[PDB]
Amino acid sequence: ASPIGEGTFDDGPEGWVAYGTDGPLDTSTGALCVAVPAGSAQYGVGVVLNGVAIEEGTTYTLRYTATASTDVTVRALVGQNGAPYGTVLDTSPALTSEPRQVTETFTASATYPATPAADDPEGQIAFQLGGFSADAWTLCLDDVALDSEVEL
């Protein structure tokens, strides 16, 4: 129904938001580069993007290429915003001074409806940058696409 702009960020980060750092995030190039503070030592830094379309135990392919000036290894995945809650992804996005593309097929065992309401929650992506690298570093993605296996 409503993906996250199947593609990179060559014209706006769509809905990718980041918090716990300096000002908002900057793109103007085709990659979401956020300024992560030194070893993000504090409440914890992160980035959230609400607006996903998952349902029951369906298939899905997460595609994203992140690159942090440093070799930071934070955590990335997906889940539901509001009870009964339900996470489908559980991995750690490693980063380095080089481009790190990511492509995997996981079975979303939950439901992320694209309708933020008082009783009807939804689902999004979680990028936790709270306490991960040592000195100040950053994250630069540029190709986020999510879809269910509808080929057959």
Swiss-Prot record:
Highest classification ranks of the organism: Bacteria, Bacillati, Actinomycetota, Actinomycetes, Micrococcales
Indicate the segments forming the CBM-cenC domain, all copies. Answer: 32-141
- Provide the family line: Belongs to the glycosyl hydrolase 9 (cellulase E) family.
This one is known as Endoglucanase C
Native species: Cellulomonas fimi (strain ATCC 484 / DSM 20113 / JCM 1341 / CCUG 24087 / LMG 16345 / NBRC 15513 / NCIMB 8980 / NCTC 7547 / NRS-133)
Role summary = The biological conversion of cellulose to glucose generally requires three types of hydrolytic enzymes: (1) Endoglucanases which cut internal beta-1,4-glucosidic bonds; (2) Exocellobiohydrolases that cut the disaccharide cellobiose from the non-reducing end of the cellulose polymer chain; (3) Beta-1,4-glucosidases which hydrolyze the cellobiose and other short cello-oligosaccharides to glucose.
